Design an enzyme around this catalytic site. Structure first.
Site, PDB file in Angstrom:
ATOM      1  N   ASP A 124       0.811  -1.224   0.000  1.00 49.24           N
ATOM      2  CA  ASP A 124       0.000   0.000   0.000  1.00 49.24           C
ATOM      3  C   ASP A 124       0.847   1.277   0.000  1.00 49.24           C
ATOM      4  O   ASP A 124       2.070   1.251   0.130  1.00 49.24           O
ATOM      5  CB  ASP A 124      -0.942   0.022   1.196  1.00 49.24           C
ATOM      6  CG  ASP A 124      -2.187  -0.801   0.967  1.00 49.24           C
ATOM      7  OD1 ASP A 124      -2.180  -1.652   0.045  1.00 49.24           O
ATOM      8  OD2 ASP A 124      -3.167  -0.614   1.716  1.00 49.24           O
ATOM      9  N   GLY A 141      15.385  -3.251   5.500  1.00 53.34           N
ATOM     10  CA  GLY A 141      16.293  -3.955   4.633  1.00 53.34           C
ATOM     11  C   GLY A 141      17.424  -4.600   5.413  1.00 53.34           C
ATOM     12  O   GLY A 141      17.840  -4.128   6.469  1.00 53.34           O
ATOM     13  N   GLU A 200       6.381  -1.041  11.539  1.00 54.66           N
ATOM     14  CA  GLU A 200       7.737  -1.180  11.039  1.00 54.66           C
ATOM     15  C   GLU A 200       8.322  -2.484  11.566  1.00 54.66           C
ATOM     16  O   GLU A 200       8.296  -2.736  12.772  1.00 54.66           O
ATOM     17  CB  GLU A 200       8.586   0.035  11.459  1.00 54.66           C
ATOM     18  CG  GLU A 200       9.955   0.122  10.793  1.00 54.66           C
ATOM     19  CD  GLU A 200       9.914   0.759   9.406  1.00 54.66           C
ATOM     20  OE1 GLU A 200       9.009   1.581   9.149  1.00 54.66           O
ATOM     21  OE2 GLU A 200      10.765   0.393   8.552  1.00 54.66           O
TER      22      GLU A 200
END
Ligand SMILES: [Cl-]
Ligand SMILES: [Cl-]
Ligand SMILES: [Cl-]
Ligand SMILES: [Cl-]
Lengths: 279, 280, 280
Positions: free
Chosen positions: A144, A169, A192
């Site tokens: 999204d 990452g 997160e």
């Protein structure tokens, strides 16, 4: 034959300081080819074993790292008023035509940004968002608006990554598992998950859940503390635990933590709504 | 006109399975006309009742839903190095020239993304951000960098949507109200308001405030608990409520909630700064 | 050039700013354009740190930025999806930039990065898809990660890491207000936000979800000192909450969000210990 390709990448990475933009030959071809295998999802940075554990194939991370030395910084067109960008990683959609998009069978909304070597599976929806090198986004997943799938991250099938979600990452250290979101997870907006943590399958994270490597995750009913992993079919929301008293003796501040409020199964997920699970 | 347009759409929506990209004629024209009315703000997904409650005009959502079936997936140009996108929703700015931007009278900063059928009012500022289908962004409102106005969201006049604020989209179920932000609301950075919750007029949300369908919103002075709604002229900050203890004898974790720290009025709001309202 | 005369002209022009518009050329336009090129090149900056360590505002550079709004017209800017346009009056920093300009500037601009003219971006900076606004200063070796925002006039020190979704809030007016400042070697964790001219002193580490505004309570876990709008050097910061007053019914009240300094380290500890260990 993946075996030969890995061998070259392992040895070439050991001599990586001698690798630059003038390097061609077998090393250049092997790295490029590996990034195409990644881009197609034919290989992936980490693979899930029978036990349910995930194991890293380090030579794929090494190929990504080697591509930084091989490719030159370059003008990339397409900016406002005909201005340019300046980078050395091509888009996944370089030279993609209608026929290419029909084959890939996913939806890419204007604003979506995907670097080459990231795999995007059929029936995925890319809202305006960013998918970095070596990522893997499986069947039917929603990415999204202003979500980020960081390098090498694994997103399972039928995952919902809500608006503003960051999946952190993980490239180095080489032995590190990338961040993993397993199948059928709902990741609420602004959440997160970074630094190689794993959200086991069927889990539902509410809005504003932050999960890092050193985040305490507490089962509200069990008292169990998890680090870097949310067990399967968990309903997770943000919370706080008591802290140490202040030097003057006054009550100390609370510290943020993630709270497991429910542990369900597969049948509960299929029958019960996300909002009911979070209520 | 509107009565007949609604009838054509609703009849077609009941027959939606026979609708595809080959469907043209009156059904195609009616859907396009309905979405253009949405785009210029001549109709809107919701109507405010006398009660102060908002109800959905379901036939407009149906028009949006039919446009998904009517339009083909296609190459859309403009990506890096001449690459393309692959979608079936046109930009709001398709074929807009200087004269269109001057008539519309809002500011669109490079990076701003708005799909067609979204209404953008005069004196709005769109920083780099995204406004989705059927949205309504009323006069003088700031849409700051990387904010999102989700599908059908209603944003009132002189609203400040700070950086990274998300107003969640609501299309189906047909009867569910979209997320609504009423006039003169300030929504602080990284805040999120989703799933059809309503923030009533003049309210101020601090940074990092999350408002969802099942979020406890408590007035710290009153003790009153609100669900899905922030009452008018509320000052709201993120907080937490105590939880149940763990069986091992340890106290349980607190759980996130939204806290109303002040309820003010129009005069208090107009004279006092945002930071003072949030300071206490 | 002579900075002293340039300041004089900008100052006088601002006093008569109501007579300045899109027809104004001559000495006033050239002077404003020059000052913004100096800002863009980092030869001048909106604030400079003094010998004592305090930051002092160069108000005339803010006035120059404000005048360029009056000088340039709203105009078509190309590059949108399917050849659509934007409608704005601030040029990109990258206007007319070629390989030689990028090679000279020596920073990396990833497709998706957006930077307005007058923002300084130093060598070895990495701009992911992100937004850098007018008058900002991004010093050597800094990473601006995906969907980060560097607000107007904000100062980012050397070797700073702004993680994904980080907001550095902008400060243009008031002229006298210091902008947001992030000093050297700071780590700002994902989704964090620092706004309203707060300063994060050198070497500090902010965890994820840390919001610091002008009116956010920051409490030192080790000393007990409470800071407002400033984090001391080499602080480790995480989100937290403080207890509230009981509800009128007699039950315990909600906690309210605050920022917590859980450790304060030094330059040697910072260089030896990873960010993740500092947060444990
Ligand atoms: Cl490319
Ligand atoms: Cl439908
Ligand atoms: Cl279009
Ligand atoms: Cl430009």
């Amino acid at each position: 034959d993946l075996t030969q390709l890995e061998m070259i990448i392992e040895k070439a990475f050991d001599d990586r300081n001698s690798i630059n933009t003038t390097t061609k030959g077998e090393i250049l071809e092997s790295v490029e080819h590996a990034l195409n295998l990644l881009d197609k999802g034919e290989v992936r940075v980490v693979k899930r074993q029978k036990n349910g554990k995930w194991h890293v194939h380090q030579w794929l991370k090494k190929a990504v790292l080697l591509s930084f030395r091989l490719n030159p910084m370059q003008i990339m067109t397409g900016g406002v008023n005909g201005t340019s960008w300046w980078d050395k990683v091509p888009s996944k959609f370089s030279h993609w035509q209608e026929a290419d998009f029909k084959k890939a069978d996913f939806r890419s909304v204007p604003g979506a940004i995907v670097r080459h070597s990231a795999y995007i599976a059929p029936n995925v929806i890319l809202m305006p968002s960013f998918v970095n090198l070596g990522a893997f986004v499986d069947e039917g997943t929603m990415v999204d608006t202003w979500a980020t799938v960081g390098s090498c991250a694994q997103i399972g099938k039928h995952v919902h990554l809500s608006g503003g979600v960051g999946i952190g990452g993980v490239l180095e250290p080489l032995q590190a598992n990338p961040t993993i979101i397993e199948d059928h997870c709902f990741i609420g907006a602004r959440s997160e998950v970074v630094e190689g943590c794993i959200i086991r399958e069927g889990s539902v994270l509410g809005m504003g859940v932050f999960i890092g490597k050193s985040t305490k995750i507490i089962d509200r009913t069990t008292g169990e503390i998890f680090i870097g992993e949310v067990p399967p079919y968990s309903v997770v929301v943000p919370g706080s635990l008591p802290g140490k008293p202040l030097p003057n003796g006054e009550i100390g501040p609370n510290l943020y933590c993630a709270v497991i409020v429910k542990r369900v199964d597969q049948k509960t997920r299929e029958k019960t709504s996300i909002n009911d699970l979070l209520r």
